[PDB]
Amino acid sequence: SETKCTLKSFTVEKGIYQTSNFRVQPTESIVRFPNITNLCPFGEVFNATRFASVYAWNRKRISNCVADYSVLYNSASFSTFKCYGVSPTKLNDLCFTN
Amino acid sequence: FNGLTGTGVLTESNKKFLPFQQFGRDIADTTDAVRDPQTLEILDITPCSFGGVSVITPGTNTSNQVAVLYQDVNCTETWRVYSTGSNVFQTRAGCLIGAEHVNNSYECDIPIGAGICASYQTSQSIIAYTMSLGAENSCAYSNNSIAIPTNFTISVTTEILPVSMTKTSVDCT
Amino acid sequence: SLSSTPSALGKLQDVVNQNAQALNTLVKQLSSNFGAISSVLNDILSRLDPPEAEVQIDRLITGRLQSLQTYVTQQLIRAAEIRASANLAATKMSECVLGQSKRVDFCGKGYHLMSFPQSAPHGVVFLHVTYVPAQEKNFTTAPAICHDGKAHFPREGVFVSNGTHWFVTQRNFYEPQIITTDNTFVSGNCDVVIGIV
Amino acid sequence: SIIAYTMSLGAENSCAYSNNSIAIPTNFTISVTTEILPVSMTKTSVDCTMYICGDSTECSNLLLQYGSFCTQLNRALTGIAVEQDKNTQEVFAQVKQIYKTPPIKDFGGFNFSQILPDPSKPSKRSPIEDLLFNKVTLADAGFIKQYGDCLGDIAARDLICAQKFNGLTVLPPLLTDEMIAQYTSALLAGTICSGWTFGAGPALQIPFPMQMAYRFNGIGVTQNVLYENQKLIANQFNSAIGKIQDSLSSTPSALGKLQDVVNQNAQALNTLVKQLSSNFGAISSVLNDILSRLDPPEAEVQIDRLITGRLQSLQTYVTQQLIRAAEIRASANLAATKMSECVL
Numbered sequence A: 001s002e003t004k005c006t007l008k009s010f011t012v013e014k015g016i017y018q019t020s021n022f023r024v025q026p027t028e029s030i031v032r033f034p035n036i037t038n039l040c041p042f043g044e045v046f047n048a049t050r051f052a053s054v055y056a057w058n059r060k061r062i063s064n065c066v067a068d069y070s071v072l073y074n075s076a077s078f079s080t081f082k083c084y085g086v087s088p089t090k091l092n093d094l095c096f097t098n
Numbered sequence B: 001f002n003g004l005t006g007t008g009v010l011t012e013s014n015k016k017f018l019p020f021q022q023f024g025r026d027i028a029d030t031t032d033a034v035r036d037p038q039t040l041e042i043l044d045i046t047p048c049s050f051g052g053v054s055v056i057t058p059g060t061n062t063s064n065q066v067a068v069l070y071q072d073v074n075c076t077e078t079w080r081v082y083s084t085g086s087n088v089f090q091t092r093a094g095c096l097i098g099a100e101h102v103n104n105s106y107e108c109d110i111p112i113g114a115g116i117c118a119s120y121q122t123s124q125s126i127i128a129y130t131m132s133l134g135a136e137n138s139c140a141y142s143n144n145s146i147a148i149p150t151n152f153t154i155s156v157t158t159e160i161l162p163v164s165m166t167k168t169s170v171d172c173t
Numbered sequence C: 001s002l003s004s005t006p007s008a009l010g011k012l013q014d015v016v017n018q019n020a021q022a023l024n025t026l027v028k029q030l031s032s033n034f035g036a037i038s039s040v041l042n043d044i045l046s047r048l049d050p051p052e053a054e055v056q057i058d059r060l061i062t063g064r065l066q067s068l069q070t071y072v073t074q075q076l077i078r079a080a081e082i083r084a085s086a087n088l089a090a091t092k093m094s095e096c097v098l099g100q101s102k103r104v105d106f107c108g109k110g111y112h113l114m115s116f117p118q119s120a121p122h123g124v125v126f127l128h129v130t131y132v133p134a135q136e137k138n139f140t141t142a143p144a145i146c147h148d149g150k151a152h153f154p155r156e157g158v159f160v161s162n163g164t165h166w167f168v169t170q171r172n173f174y175e176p177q178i179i180t181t182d183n184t185f186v187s188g189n190c191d192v193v194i195g196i197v
Numbered sequence D: 001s002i003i004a005y006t007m008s009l010g011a012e013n014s015c016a017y018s019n020n021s022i023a024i025p026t027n028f029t030i031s032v033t034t035e036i037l038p039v040s041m042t043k044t045s046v047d048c049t050m051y052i053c054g055d056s057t058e059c060s061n062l063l064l065q066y067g068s069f070c071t072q073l074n075r076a077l078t079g080i081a082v083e084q085d086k087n088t089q090e091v092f093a094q095v096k097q098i099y100k101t102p103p104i105k106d107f108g109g110f111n112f113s114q115i116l117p118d119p120s121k122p123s124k125r126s127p128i129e130d131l132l133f134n135k136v137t138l139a140d141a142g143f144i145k146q147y148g149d150c151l152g153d154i155a156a157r158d159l160i161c162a163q164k165f166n167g168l169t170v171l172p173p174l175l176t177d178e179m180i181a182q183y184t185s186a187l188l189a190g191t192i193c194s195g196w197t198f199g200a201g202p203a204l205q206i207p208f209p210m211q212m213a214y215r216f217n218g219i220g221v222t223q224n225v226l227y228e229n230q231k232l233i234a235n236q237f238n239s240a241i242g243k244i245q246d247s248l249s250s251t252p253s254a255l256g257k258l259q260d261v262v263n264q265n266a267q268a269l270n271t272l273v274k275q276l277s278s279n280f281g282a283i284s285s286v287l288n289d290i291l292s293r294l295d296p297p298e299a300e301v302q303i304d305r306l307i308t309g310r311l312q313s314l315q316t317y318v319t320q321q322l323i324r325a326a327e328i329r330a331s332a333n334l335a336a337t338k339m340s341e342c343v344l
């Protein structure tokens, strides 16, 4: 039937027909991440008492924590949330290095 | 692995990464090895299959029986085989399943490869066999003897050559 | 033989089939989407505004142009094969039909006698007439005759012997002749040639 | 240092024009020369789906929009593979009778021990044939690789594993080396025992010195020259053959044309493997990174860019492979002509 489909015919002539490949399918999903238990400091970032002047803006490194953006849904309403490197729906599936 | 997805078979690696190197990549710029993010082991990753499947089919106006050749399966040494049902004949071209193995050489019909061919024979089945290159003969070497024709025949044969093909013009617009 | 065998002219049918498949391939490839929202140009023009239609149209133009270029390249290579075949056919016409060639198997198996070309759809069929040896016999031979101490060699043919008598025959046909001075030449003497009778 | 110079076209010579004088040979020599022709090239099949898509369902679904191009390329490569066996048989399938090699290897002083197969070796090849096989280097140690070995890391990064993983399949020839050697041996036995009669039809035995006498008559020299100097001629023949064996063994480039054919196909496949890694304008050369970081519509845009890239790569490969196939066909036709016209 695979050959009949390949040739778009219900009649197949005498000979040898090559028809794709024998492929082994995965049987299980194996996921590995570092055992990071700390939640990222979203409070300090979004619930800060004061923000620095734009002329003298601050930057800090975030490390050794778990990112979860659903915590902000009942915290504040955001006017802009635009991602360029990654689509928003995939943010929870990645792990970042810097 | 840490956001890097794919399908394959994991094995222990014999490679050692530098203290700062996390991933190994092949000449194709695909992942060949990963340092596991949970335990700092070096693992290799290989695709799950090479495929290499072709089907030997007689014409459908005679019989619906088929045989399948697996180019990279060593059935003599599972086996990356869809189905078996006995009739397993290993060749240098790979093992095939469904045809009978007959050791009586014969004229080739459906070529398989590496000296093996197949045909459909009558209790009908697909027969796999070693090709017969020609009839065996001999000619004596005698330094004091010759053969001379005493009779002759007129023989007429044909030769076919293409001369032309249909001329086609295409209006690309 | 020609009437009985449906595949006698298979090479010509194959040429016709290859061109028919190439054109049906172009017709079928016309229907591909090529990444566009629709394979039909009128749907794109009907539902989309100018700049969006232009993007989808450009995708279809790239698709169809690539399809035509692939067709032309394959058609040109097949044309090259036809040119090689036609040159061989013309050579066979001049060399086998308008003359007699000595080349083995060039004008058919056996020794070439003559040929008769015939026309055919998109091609030529040659009928070659050859001379083929048939019944043969085993005879004793020798490279030379020693009549009077001189070495006698045949002018033409081969020295052949039956159980009791020696003759001269043509290599391609057994007509034993008496060995005489009119079909034999003399050079050298009986002490050099091996196996002189 | 590196020296630049005007080329010498050849040695200068002259020949007097004298209306009352001729030159005539008084002696002669038997000369043995070689001619090398390609007959076939490695048969390659490509799975255009495995090559384009890394077992990605989304990639496959996009590929179906161009599926007939993938099928057409597969068909062209299949046609080439078929032609390689047709060419091989046309060069080596002119005689349908397999003649036994006589137990005698020396006929009238003519020594064929270096020409006829040696029955004591696993490979039924002559010493000269064995040397021919020991000069051309083939990367593929047969056609069955299996799934093992390639499962782990290959320290040498054996190219056949990578090529097969990307859908590039090397196919076995229809005729084996043993079959070709056997056929050729049959042709040698045919000519030695019956001269050219077996080509035209039945093989008629003729003592070898008479076949040579007929050949001399064909040259335009009386049979007397061969019979008068038979021993000298046989000695020159045997020495010329020994010279061929030494010439072939000594020169590493004697079969360069065949090595070039093998190298061209190896480079074409390594080129496809390397081209797989190009970005083609996409954010990443790896399909899984695009699927992991981007959502459906953005992944589809980057995937479409990669599909166009890989499909163009395969089409370029197929076109170049087909043109090389055309050159091989021309070579095979010349080789078959030489077989019928020079050997038979």
Ligand SMILES: *[C@@H]1O[C@H](CO)[C@@H](O[C@@H]2O[C@H](CO)[C@@H](O)[C@H](O)[C@H]2NC(C)=O)[C@H](O)[C@H]1NC(C)=O
Pocket: B138, B139, B140, B141, B142, B147, C136, C137, C138
């Ligand atoms: C010519 O003589 C040879 C022998 O020199 C014949 O070949 C033999 O034929 C018989 C059958 O009649 C076989 O059994 C032998 O094995 C053959 N021997 C060989 C080839 O060495 C040959 O048939 C004779 N031909 C004619 C036309 O008389």
Ligand SMILES: *[C@@H]1O[C@H](CO)[C@@H](O[C@@H]2O[C@H](CO)[C@@H](O)[C@H](O)[C@H]2NC(C)=O)[C@H](O)[C@H]1NC(C)=O
Pocket: C162, C163, C164, C165
């Ligand atoms: C070889 O051929 C010769 C010539 O035909 C044969 O000798 C002749 O035989 C006939 C009888 O059949 C006689 O009438 C002739 O006089 C003979 N000729 C000569 C010159 O003697 C001879 O018999 C044949 N030999 C064999 C063994 O067949």
Ligand SMILES: *[C@@H]1O[C@H](CO)[C@@H](O[C@@H]2O[C@H](CO)[C@@H](O)[C@H](O)[C@H]2NC(C)=O)[C@H](O)[C@H]1NC(C)=O
Pocket: D014, D015, D016, D017, D018, D023
């Ligand atoms: C045959 O005669 C020609 C002259 O007609 C010879 O050619 C000359 O050879 C000498 C060397 O011996 C040269 O110096 C002359 O310049 C040649 N002259 C020519 C070519 O006009 C030739 O060598 C003689 N060959 C033989 C075999 O005797």
Ligand SMILES: *[C@@H]1O[C@H](CO)[C@@H](O[C@@H]2O[C@H](CO)[C@@H](O)[C@H](O)[C@H]2NC(C)=O)[C@H](O)[C@H]1NC(C)=O
Pocket: D106, D111, D112, D113, D114
């Ligand atoms: C025919 O040639 C072979 C070589 O191809 C000769 O066999 C060689 O004989 C010499 C002694 O003369 C040995 O040292 C070599 O080792 C032999 N070589 C092989 C490959 O066997 C053979 O003697 C020659 N025969 C004749 C009659 O000249």
Ligand SMILES: *[C@@H]1O[C@H](CO)[C@@H](O[C@@H]2O[C@H](CO)[C@@H](O)[C@H](O)[C@H]2NC(C)=O)[C@H](O)[C@H]1NC(C)=O
Pocket: D027, D028, D029, D231, D232, D233, D235, D236
């Ligand atoms: C013709 O040339 C051959 C060589 O091609 C000569 O034969 C050799 O002659 C030398 C002496 O000059 C001997 O040492 C060799 O042993 C000979 N070789 C052979 C194989 O016999 C021959 O002398 C020349 N002259 C003629 C034939 O008249």
Ligand SMILES: *[C@@H]1O[C@H](CO)[C@@H](O)[C@H](O)[C@H]1NC(C)=O
Pocket: A034, A035, B037, B038, B039, B040
């Ligand atoms: C967590 O990861 C670190 C770093 O590899 C490792 O040393 C540690 O054992 C892991 N702990 C657990 C509980 O998995």
Ligand SMILES: *[C@@H]1O[C@H](CO)[C@@H](O)[C@H](O)[C@H]1NC(C)=O
Pocket: A042, A043, A044, A046, A047, A071, A072, A074, A075
């Ligand atoms: C900020 O404070 C509010 C309470 O006023 C709390 O609900 C919210 O979770 C805090 N935000 C973060 C990011 O922790």
Ligand SMILES: *[C@@H]1O[C@H](CO)[C@@H](O)[C@H](O)[C@H]1NC(C)=O
Pocket: B074, B075, B076, B077, B090, B091, B092, B094, B095, D144
């Ligand atoms: C299978 O493996 C064995 C052991 O390496 C080998 O001898 C044999 O040739 C292989 N292939 C076949 C088709 O038997």
Ligand SMILES: *[C@@H]1O[C@H](CO)[C@@H](O)[C@H](O)[C@H]1NC(C)=O
Pocket: B143, B144, C194, C195
């Ligand atoms: C022919 O060969 C035999 C060996 O089979 C030998 O005895 C005989 O002398 C040779 N005759 C000639 C004329 O060469």
